[PDB]
Amino acid sequence: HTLQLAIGDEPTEGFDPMLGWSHGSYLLLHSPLLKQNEDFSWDSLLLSQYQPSDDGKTWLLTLKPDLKFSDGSPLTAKDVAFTYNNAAASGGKVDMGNFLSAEVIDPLNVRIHLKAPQSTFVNVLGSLGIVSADKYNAKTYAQKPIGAGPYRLVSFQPGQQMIVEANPYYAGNKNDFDKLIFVFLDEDSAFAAAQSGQLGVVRIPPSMAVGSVNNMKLWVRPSVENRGIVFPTTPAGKKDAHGYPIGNDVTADVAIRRAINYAINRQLLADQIMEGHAIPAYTGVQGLPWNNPDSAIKDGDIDKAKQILEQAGWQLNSQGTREKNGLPAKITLWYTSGDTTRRDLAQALRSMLKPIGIDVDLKSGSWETVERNMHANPTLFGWGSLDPMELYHHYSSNAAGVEYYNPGYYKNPMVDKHLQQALDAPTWQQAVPFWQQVDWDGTTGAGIRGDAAWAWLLNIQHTYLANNCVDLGKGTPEIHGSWSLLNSIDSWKWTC
Ligand SMILES: N[C@@H](Cc1c[nH]c[nH+]1)C(=O)O
Ligand SMILES: N[C@@H](Cc1c[nH]c[nH+]1)C(=O)O
Ligand code: NI
Secondary structure (H helix, E strand, C coil): CEEEEECCCCCCCCCCCCCCCCCCCHHHHCCCCEEECCCCCEEECCEEEEEECCCCCEEEEEECCCEECCCCCEECHHHHHHHHHHHHHHCCCCCCCCEEEEEEEECCEEEEEECCCCCCHHHHHCCCCCCCCCCCCHHHHCCCCCCCCCEEEEEEECCCEEEEEECCCCCCCCCCCCEEEEECCCHHHHHHHHHCCCCCEEEECHHHCCCCCCCEEEEEECECCEEEEECCCCCCCEECCCCCEECCCCCCCHHHHHHHHHHCCHHHHHHHHCCCCEEECCCCCCCCCCCCCCCCCCCCCHHHHHHHHHHCCCEECCCCCEEECCEECEEEEEEECCCHHHHHHHHHHHHHHHHHCCEEEEEEECHHHHHHHCCCCCEEECCCCCCCHHHHHHHCHHHCCCCCCCCCCCCCHHHHHHHHHHHCCCCHHHHHHHHHHCCCCCCCCCCCCCCCCEEEEEEECEEEEEECCEECCCCCCECCCCCHHHHHHHHCEECC
């Protein structure tokens, strides 16, 4: 069967695990050693056995026999070792952490050596795609790659489409669709093509998940993708390396941040903006094992927000705005244009924070424009993944100002300690208790009970429209990024 999908952003700069697995359409053409389960354990497509040592410093990987690539070339230990070592030394992103080396014992066994225990290396094992040691070249791979994925590339028209076909050498199960065509369209054009019957699967914003489309069915997919506001946690007066202002004199007050957290009604955000297709999120890891269980509050509480503001010395002035030492609680919320739900979320927040006396300005821009103001102003972001490293990216002092990570320049030495403890655990199960202390350790934290570096809002569920004859099956909770639906691609069925 042939299926046409418009599910997200267009892939830019190639299909090479070596250059970066950032896009997320690699799930189509590639396959890592491990695949994550719904209980956050790990299974494997390519391995019969994978055992880390008790020290957590080394991994032993036994490959399944008779594995092949999309071109029919054999998949063995040489290719795994080549993959990991080359991605390690390439220096082009690809976080390998404490990785040292991959040694080939026999055609079916690889031994991975790490500098120190790393609880997140299991995420590397579950992300980095395997390339062919012989056939890999940085020039010809990006355009026409070979992998262990369920599909192999056939055609690619930039700005137009991308055509792939089922890989006969796939080690996993086959679905009911032998050919897939992915069209690159904006959300509205995609919806139009869905209603016209041109496409079988289309991704739509939750706002549009309303009413009935002919010969189509809505699919709500569980997701850890989120929406939240990041606060500048330091006073103003400093600039970064690129001359962008850092800090906000209003939001540097922790009371402001806690009050904003308590005044917001997350359930109303879900029901009124996301059409019920979100769940309230009080953290960046909402619903995950490493989420602090006590990190939730009873929000939409105006009187408590007012009480918090009054306790810190924020009083209404003659103009009806909170003032403290002549400084009014006037803030500007920034967000990225080109997204309707973000505009609506920002507006809704502006309306939600008014009754507690906080005046919210709105400013939308391109990411290039947002980059300049995201350190000096509260900003809308979306994140979320099955990788606990998010907590690091958000709350590590070393991540402050780096790319889009930690724009509020949050620095708490104890939180850094807990993060480092989590990283240095041999297993992720042992790391989980340390990840939770990031929120609150009983003394300090980055959560609401703590410094409240964020006003986290929602975990957004992904919405699709599929033909009535198409079953999208199930998979792990989808994440922030594009082409997340692909995580379920093996389970796809044709019911007509
Ligand atoms: N991932 C973050 C930041 C970002 C910048 N560019 C792409 N993403 C967001 O979507 O809000
Ligand atoms: N690759 C982008 C995806 C994105 C589009 N818009 C926002 N985010 C990211 O990780 O943030
Ligand atoms: Ni993003």
